[PDB]
Each structure stands twice: as structure tokens, then as C-alpha cells.
Design a protein around this ligand. Structure first.
Ligand SMILES: [Cl-]
Ligand SMILES: [Cl-]
Length: 164
């Protein structure tokens, strides 16, 4: 197990434009196209992110290219942010994948807001961090996936992603 196979589980794979949980036009392995209501503006972004005329459908190879750019972008977003780089530094290879999984979902800004949770994780107060991380929209709006990530933080293992 690794960060790639981990996010591929939470995100899935659909090759035609779809609406993510929140209702936003999405494609591939959880690649948010836009927060606009207009489908024609979703298509536009897609064409611009792939470099051709798509019409709302892409191939598996393309879907995985955005996935690689997206995972790369989530790591670089952490190592540039004054509140995320120290924490990421203090974590093991499993708890680093979890912190990425968050950034990938809700963005660097959204994670960097979790001030009190970040501190706990930095103090290696795991059980306490797990309880704090659950008092959030992230947990109510997408509870199953969140309690997979929270379990990773609490345990430092792959147990939540292994029986799948
Ligand atoms: Cl709450
Ligand atoms: Cl869920």
C-alpha cells in the first residue's frame, strides 16, 4: 500500500465528467474541474487541462496523468506552507500519506485551517488528534472516508485500507 493506491480507493475512477460529493463537476481520479454550475465551463477546463477537444470523456492513461500531477501538487503544496511543512516533517511514511490524502481532498488552505489538530499530530498525541479531527464538516459530509484517514493517523498502519 502507498499514497497512490490509497487515494485511488477513496476517489475511484470515472472517465466521463461527473459530480463530486459536493455537486462540483469532476473527472478521473478525483480531479476537481470547477466550482461553476455551468457544464460548458466544466468542459472548457477539461480541454485546457488535457490539451485537446474532449467532449467530457477521457482515457485511462489521461486520467492517470492528472492523478500524478495532482499528487505531486499536493506534496509541493505542503512543503511550501509554514503550517504544514513542520508537521509533515514530524510524521512517519504512513502518517505522511494521510496528511497528503487530506490536502488532496480539501486543498492546502483547508487543511492548514485545522490548527488544533495539526498541533496534536505534531505533539504525537494520536488518540487526541483523532477525536479532534472528527469535529468537522469534513467528517460529517464524508464520514466513511474521513474515518479511514483518521484511523491512519491514530494507528500509523494501513489497516483501514487493507481489507478491500
Ligand atoms: Cl462539528
Ligand atoms: Cl464517504
Amino acid at each position: 500500500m502507498n499514497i497512490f493506491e490509497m487515494l485511488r480507493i477513496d476517489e475511484g475512477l470515472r472517465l466521463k465528467i461527473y459530480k463530486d460529493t459536493e455537486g462540483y463537476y469532476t473527472i478521473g481520479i478525483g480531479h476537481l474541474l470547477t466550482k461553476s454550475p455551468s457544464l460548458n465551463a466544466a468542459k472548457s477546463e477539461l480541454d485546457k487541462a488535457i490539451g485537446r477537444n474532449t467532449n467530457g470523456v477521457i482515457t485511462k492513461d489521461e486520467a492517470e496523468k492528472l492523478f500524478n500531477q495532482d499528487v505531486d501538487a499536493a506534496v509541493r503544496g505542503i512543503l511550501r506552507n509554514a503550517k504544514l511543512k513542520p508537521v509533515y516533517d514530524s510524521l512517519d511514511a504512513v502518517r505522511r500519506a494521510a496528511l497528503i490524502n487530506m490536502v488532496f481532498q480539501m486543498g492546502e488552505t483547508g487543511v492548514a485551517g485545522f490548527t488544533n489538530s495539526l498541533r496534536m499530530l505534531q505533539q504525537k498525541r494520536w488518540d487526541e488528534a483523532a477525536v479532534n479531527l472528527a469535529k468537522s464538516r469534513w467528517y460529517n459530509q464524508t464520514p466513511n472516508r474521513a474515518k479511514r484517514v483518521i484511523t491512519t493517523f491514530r494507528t500509523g498502519t494501513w489497516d483501514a485500507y487493507k481489507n478491500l
